[PDB]
Structures are given as structure tokens and as C-alpha cells.
Ligand SMILES: *[B]([O])([O])[C]([C]C1=[C][C]=[C][C]=[C]1)[N]C(=O)[C]([C]C1=[C][C]=[C][C]=[C]1)[N]C(=O)C1=[C]N=[C][C]=N1
Ligand SMILES: *[B]([O])([O])[C]([C]C1=[C][C]=[C][C]=[C]1)[N]C(=O)[C]([C]C1=[C][C]=[C][C]=[C]1)[N]C(=O)C1=[C]N=[C][C]=N1
């Protein structure tokens with residue numbers, strides 16, 4: 001489970017991403033009314049984690065022994081975008097490595113296959129929403145430090 | 150051309166039009182920073198608006214507390230007169246990376262840089278193509294992979310990657326739609342480097358279609374791609390042989406700065422871009 | 434066997450965590466017309482029993 | 484009326500138009516369908532202001548002390564307003580009528596737009612008047628009607644001038660997004676004719692025929708979006724974006 | 732040698748070239764900017780009977 | 782207009798229809814919005830080749 005941040009036209013919103021790793025054959029299910037860009041970012045994060053399978057203590061062959069399921073509550077609310085990349089990377093790595101993720105840290109950021117964190121948009125609504133809900137720690141891309149002013 | 154137009158015609162008009170007369174002045178680096186970081190347009194009107202903003206800032210700072218003579222605005226003072234930079238220029242890499250290659254794109258507002266990146270993980274012979282790619286570009290990827298499956302002994306590729314390796318091709322960023330066939334070679338370089346564990350030189354941009362038997366076919370829009378490759382600091386281009394008739398549309402100082410190599414076969418590209426020794430352990 | 438004299442409603446998440454719903458009034462009135470006297474309801478909907 | 488008309492103000496073509504109704508003597512005590520139109524015409528002619536202005540303060544430090552005690556937040560919007568006002572006071576003569584980067588206030592509904600217009604108009608100590616442009620789709624709603632008709636009515640700007648006797652008031656053209664254009668009519672051409680400060684000095688109506696003092700009459704426009712303003716009006720503007728408010 | 736048309740993106744100088752051509756041959760310069768209506772009944776007028 | 786209707790053309794039924802329309806236009810008073818429609822219609826019937 002990891003804590004993420006969204007952008008509505010009337011302000012920001014906390015969103016929780018939770019994933020499950022159950023025994024299976026390697027399928028990937030993606031529920032919660034997700035758009036196409038968000039499914040592609042989840043697939044990019046999973047490919048990055050399959051490449052670096054020894055750096056983080058992941059199992060050696062989870063690509064054909066584990067079915068993953070990525071769910072973003074709630075249903076009946078369509079969600080899209082790509083700023084959710086490192087949140088899903090954190091959630092998938094926490095579920096595969098059986099290591100708990102800290103929930104008192106919000107995060108946001110687009111991911112690529114080399115593991116590079118890309119800039120995002122709408123940073124001040126997300127940070128105001130994270131502040132007025134009681135979260136005091138943020139992970140942000142370095143190329144968004146211009147907009148912290 | 151935008152820098153020269155802003156020097157000659159635009160900036161004195163905006164200064165005289167705002168009320169200042171020679172109590173304020175910009176340099177050339179400030180003009181190039183304003184163009185590159187506050188303006189994305191084919192015309193010139195947004196740059197005219199930005200110079201108007203700078204002159205109106207200077208008029209307000211004159212009317213708060215005046216100064217003596219001339220004040221020369223440098224490139225550091227542009228965010229103090231315009232705010233947060235709202236665009237990010239393209240940067241060229243410098244290190245040979247394994248599994249990626251440097252490509253060129255084309256918009257109706259100017260060429261950009263695009264980076265193809267490919268991961269090769271153990272699996273069962275499945276191809277994934279993400280990054281909002283159209284159909285022509287997916288078929289270009291399939292043609293490049295079939296050429297590489299037919300020629301595994303020539304490049305040191307593994308003997309059975311068609312049923313032991315999953316491939317994934319990603320083109321950042323994931324939100325803008327990307328289409329066309331002009332990057333057939335870039336994908337063939339990236340897939341071959343990802344499968345054979347040897348790095349690809351990021352000094353060199355490249356373009357051109359590919360056929361199923363390995364012929365580099367000509368492409369379109371070469372001057373915008375070459376200008377964008379020159380502005381980002383890349384001095385080596387791989388280009389199809391059939392586009393040498395179109396190099397005469399470039400400025401002379403741009404053409405002297407670029408070292409252009411003209412190809413017909415894909416093997417000429419893979420000999421030139423890949424470094425001859427593996428650095429990582431193989432996939433399977 | 435699941436006992437059938439209990440009507441229930443609620444949204445489930447992947448962690449096993451019941452989340453609130455809408456239209457509680459009409460659902461409880463329809464369950465009370467039919468003769469069901471036992472309801473399972475999420476905790477965040479007790480503000481709407483009023 | 485010949486007591487009323489020979490007073491302070493009016494130019495001399497106005498006087499040649501003003502000597503029209505001496506020999507328009509007897510058609511109003513009996514009849515007529517177009518008798519009170521001339522009575523009302525010279526009432527309009529002596530009613531509009533002439534040669535009386537309010538002397539203006541243009542100090543930006545007094546403008547900050549006006550704006551900050553009327554609104555909370557909106558500090559960057561205040562600063563861009565100050566920049567526009569500073570370049571307004573700094574230019575006299577040339578390049579003040581060649582370039583009017585006319586203010587456009589863009590934001591969602593519910594933010595303070597009209598209140599900023601009244602606060603700007605109270606900062607320069609001048610007399611505010613608001614003209615809404617909601618359902619406006621005909622040029623005679625901005626211009627006049629011909630006095631040769633039964634119902635002849637001048638435009639809204641003659642009303643805005645006859646409210647307050649200053650030569651140069653502050654007028655807020657509210658909601659120019661909603662100017663609907665179709666076949667046979669759009670008053671955006673009259674908007675460009677009255678709005679660009681290089682042909683508005685030769686403005687006229689279909690009701691009155693004299694030129695006007697629409698020279699330093701300060702203008703502010705508001706909008707909810709940009710994409711429905713006509714393109715010949717989207718060259719004389721300078722947008723200022725009001726985003727929406729923080730919880731605190 | 733027929734009607735000349737000037738094609739390109741906006742922002743590139745396409746009106747200032749027209750003024751340069753007009754002043755080079757000592758004419759005068761106008762600009763209709765058509766498209767403000769949705770009919771062919773505003774290029775040609777309507778008669779007095781309307 | 783009566784002379785013009787008599788000169789050019791016409792088929793016989795079209796001629797009688799145009800003459801009845803002309804008499805109808807002669808009975809009514811001018812400037813009314815009924816009269817301009819009949820005047821425009823007779824203008825179209827006369828200047829079409831028969
Ligand atoms: B990211 O791209 O900036 C982000 C994606 C996201 C974040 C957290 C949870 C799900 C998705 N995008 C958004 O904030 C999107 C809106 C958006 C999408 C594309 C471009 C710009 C902005 N947010 C949502 O989808 C959303 C859904 N429900 C409520 C609020 N926001
Ligand atoms: B090529 O066809 O000249 C090239 C395709 C391409 C390949 C790899 C990455 C990006 C693009 N074309 C373009 O750059 C296209 C325009 C095009 C498309 C189809 C046929 C002819 C020309 N441009 C883009 O896809 C693009 C441009 N800018 C940003 C994002 N995408």
C-alpha cells in the first residue's frame with residue numbers, strides 16, 4: 001500500500017494505491033476504472049522491477065508464479081494520468097518483498113524503464129491537499145523544485 | 150532568426166511602447182533564455198508578449214525607486230521579471246547506456262529529441278509496446294524485431310530469444326501521442342543493444358525507416374530534426390543515403406558543425422553505434 | 434451455509450476494508466417491507482440513519 | 484432648453500445640431516408620433532458630460548493601500564494590475580493610444596472579479612459604472628437607433644457616460660464571453676470600434692451624430708474563458724488569470 | 732499569373748509583408764478579416780425591401 | 782411589369798398565374814411586407830428564359 005496525490009479541478013485529493021500478490025501464473029489485473037496511460041505506467045514500473053530483481057530482495061521468478069492485482073479505490077470514479085508511477089512502484093515492491101511501506105509520506109512522480117523520475121504537473125494543489133490532511137513529508141521529482149515557490 | 154528579430158525589430162518597439170527609453174536593456178543570453186524557456190510557437194507573437202512583460206516590470210521598478218542611467222538585465226534576472234520557467238529544454242546524454250538509443254522527432258512547431266528505451270527480461274517471447282504509440286510505429290517495431298530474429302549470428306544475439314525473452318519498448322513520456330515510421334532504425338539499435346548486452350553511443354542521433362530485409366528507406370522533415378539535434382548539442386547524425394539531396398536546405402554553419410554519416414543497410418548502423426564488448430550478464 | 438435473514442451492503446477494497454455507500458434510506462425501507470430485521474452496514478454510514 | 488444649451492461644455496458642431504429645434508416648434512402639444520424624439524434628443528444632447536473631469540491619482544503606493552484593505556490574497560493579480568497602472572501613468576502622448584493592452588480578468592465563477600473592478604475604480608478616485616454584455620447580439624444594442632424611427636434608443640455607453648459627469652470614468656465590460664454571434668449580427672465590430680483607442684475618438688451613434696470623449700475612459704473586461712472571444716478582439720488584450728482560492 | 736495567397740502559421744509576418752508591398756508601390760492598405768458571419772449573405776448585401 | 786409579362790415567354794398556365802398574381806399585387810397597398818414578396822416573385826418569373 002502506498003499514499004498518492006491527485007489533481008481535481010477544485011483542488012487536490014489523497015488516493016491510496018493497494019496491490020496484492022497471490023500465487024498464480026503471472027497475470028496482471030488492473031481495476032478501479034483506470035485509463036490507458038495509467039495502465040501503461042503500471043506496466044513500466046513492473047518491468048523495471050523485473051529487471052532489477054536482486055537489488056530489492058524480490059523473489060527470483062515471480063514473473064510466472066505470482067498473479068498481481070492493482071486496485072485503486074474507489075470504483076465508479078474514473079482515474080487517469082501518468083503521475084502515479086513511483087507510487088505503483090512502491091506498492092508493487094512492498095507487496096512482492098513483504099516489506100511494509102510508510103503511509104505517513106505522500107509521493108508523486110512519473111517513472112520510465114531505466115528508473116528515472118520525470119516531472120509532473122499540478123504540484124501546488126497536491127501539496128496543499130497533503131498538508132491540510134496531516135501529512136508532513138513529500139517525495140517529489142528534482143525537476144519540480146522550480147514550482148515550490 | 151527569432152534572436153535576430155527580437156534584437157532588431159521587437160525589443161526597441163516594446164521598450165518605446167512601454168515608456169522606457171534607454172533606462173533599461175537586455176543582453177543576448179536573456180533573449181535566448183526567454184525564447185527557449187517561455188515560448189513554444191512557430192510564429193513570434195508570444196516572444197513579443199514576453200518582452201512587453203519585461204518592459205512593464207522595468208517600468209514598475211522605475212516608478213518604485215528610480216536609478217541612474219542604464220540597467221542591463223542578465224540571464225539570471227529573467228525569473229525575477231517573468232516568474233517560473235514554464236518549459237524545459239531537451240538535454241543530450243553523454244554516457245553509453247545499454248538498451249537505449251537517441252531518436253529525432255518532428256512537430257509542426259519544431260523538431261524535438263526522443264529516447265527509445267528497451268528492457269529485455271526473462272519470460273516467454275512476448276512483446277509489449279507502451280508510450281501511446283500508433284499503429285505504424287508498432288508495425289515498425291515488429292519489422293525491426295523480425296530482421297533481428299533472422300540475423301542472430303551476425304550480431305552476437307542469443308540463439309533462442311524468440312521464446313525465452315520478453316521485450317518491452319517504451320518511449321517517454323507516456324502522455325503524448327507518438328506516431329510514424331521514421332524511427333525504424335532507432336528501435337533496431339535499441340533492441341539489439343538490449344539483447345546483446347552491449348552499450349549504445351548516445352552521442353549520435355539517428356532516423357530512417359527499415360524494411361524487413363534491412364534496407365534504410367528515406368524519411369521526411371530532415372531540416373527540423375537536424376536543427377533540433379544541433380541546438381541540443383549533438384554533432385553526429387546517421388541518415389539514409391536517399392536524403393543526401395536534402396542537406397542543401399540547412400544553414401552553412403549548422404552543416405559545418407555536424408558530422409553526417411549516410412547509410413543504406415542496417416548493419417552499417419549496428420556496426421557504428423554498438424560498443425564491441427558486453428558489459429552486463431545476459432538475460433537467460 | 435450463509436444465513437439469509439440478514440441483508441447486507443457495502444463496498445469492498447483489496448485489503449478487506451469496507452467503504453461507505455449511497456442510498457441507505459431506500460435500501461433499509463425496502464428491507465423492512467420484506468420482513469428482514471438484521472442489517473450489515475459500513476461504519477461510515479451511521480451518520481445517515483438519522 | 485435654449486437656457487439649458489448655451490451653458491458650459493459643448494463643441495460647435497454640437498451647437499449647429501443644437502439650433503435644430505427652434506423651428507421644430509409645434510408638433511408636440513398636439514401629436515405627434517415623432518415629436519418627443521427631438522425633445523428627448525436635445526435632452527440627451529445637453530445631458531452627456533462635457534469638459535468636467537476628476538483629477539486622478541496614479542500613485543502605485545496609494546493603489547496598494549487601496550487594494551489591500553478591500554481584498555485578501557490575490558497578491559500576484561494585484562501586482563500585474565499595478566504593472567498595468569504603472570505603464571498607464573508612465574506613457575503620455577505617443578504609445579499610450581497606439582497600444583492599450585486592455586485588461587482581461589479570467590477565472591471561474593465565484594472569485595472576486597467585479598469587486599476588483601470597483602476597487603480599481605475607487606483607487607483612482609474615479610466614478611465606476613458596470614455594463615454587462617450577457618445576451619448582447621446586435622450592433623444597435625451598442626450603437627444607437629436611428630431617430631427617424633418611433634423607438635430610437637442610444638447605446639449602453641451613452642448611459643454609462645450620462646450616469647457620472649466625469650469625462651473619463653472607469654467602465655467594466657462584464658462577461659464578453661457571452662456575446663453570441665450568428666447570421667445577421669454581432670456587435671464585436673462595434674466593440675473593436677469603441678475599444679481600440681485610435682478610432683474611438685471619432686465615435687458616433689445612430690441616434691446622436693457628434694464625436695465623443697472616449698479617449699482616456701478606462702476600460703476593464705472580464706471573462707470566464709478565452710476560446711469564445713473573437714480573434715480581432717484578441718489582439719488588443721492582456722490577460723490576467725485568477726485561479727481560485729485556498730482553504731485558508 | 733494568378734491570385735497570390737500567403738500560407739503559414741500565425742505569428743509569422745503575413746500582414747506586415749502586405750504593408751511592405753503596399754508601401755513599396757505607394758498604394759493604401761486595408762484588411763477585411765472575413766469569417767465573422769456564417770453565410771454568403773454578408774459578402775453581398777441585402778436590398779432596401781428587407 | 783405587365784408589358785414585360787406579356788412580351789417574354791410564356792406557357793399559358795404560367796401566364797394566367799402571373800397575371801392573377803399581378804392583379805393581387807395591384808389591389809394591395811405598397812410598402813406592406815405582403816407586397817415585397819409578390820414583387821420579388823414576379824421579378825423572378827419575368828427574367829428567367831422561356
Ligand atoms: B498525475 O498524472 O498528475 C495524476 C494521476 C493520478 C494520481 C493519483 C491517483 C490516480 C491518478 N493525474 C491526476 O491527478 C488525475 C487528473 C489528471 C489526469 C491527467 C492529466 C492531468 C490531470 N486525477 C485523477 O484521475 C482523479 C480521479 N479522481 C479524483 C481526482 N483525480
Ligand atoms: B518520423 O515519422 O519522421 C517521426 C516518427 C517518430 C518516431 C519516434 C518518435 C517520435 C516520432 N515522426 C514524428 O516525429 C511524428 C510526426 C510524423 C508522424 C507520422 C508520419 C510522419 C510524421 N511526430 C511525433 O510523433 C511527435 C512529435 N512531437 C512529440 C511527440 N510525438
Ligand SMILES: Nc1ncnc2c1ncn2[C@@H]1O[C@H](COP(=O)(O)OP(=O)(O)OP(O)(O)=S)[C@@H](O)[C@H]1O
Pocket residue numbers: 553554555556557591592593594595596597598
Ligand atoms: N478574494 C476575495 N476577497 C473578498 N471577497 C471576495 C473575494 N472573492 C470573492 N469575494 C466575494 O464574493 C462575492 C461574489 O463575488 P462576484 O464577483 O460576484 O463573483 P463572480 O465570480 O465575479 O461571479 P460571476 O458570476 O463569475 S460574474 C462578493 O461578495 C465578493 O466580495
Ligand SMILES: Nc1ncnc2c1ncn2[C@@H]1O[C@H](COP(=O)(O)OP(=O)(O)O)[C@@H](O)[C@H]1O
Pocket residue numbers: 154158192193194740741742743744745746747748
Ligand atoms: N521576418 C520578420 N522580420 C521582422 N519582423 C517580423 C518578421 N516576422 C514577424 N515579424 C513581426 O511580428 C509581427 C507579427 O504580426 P502579423 O504579421 O500580424 O502576424 P500574422 O501575420 O501571423 O497575423 C509583425 O508586426 C512583425 O513586425
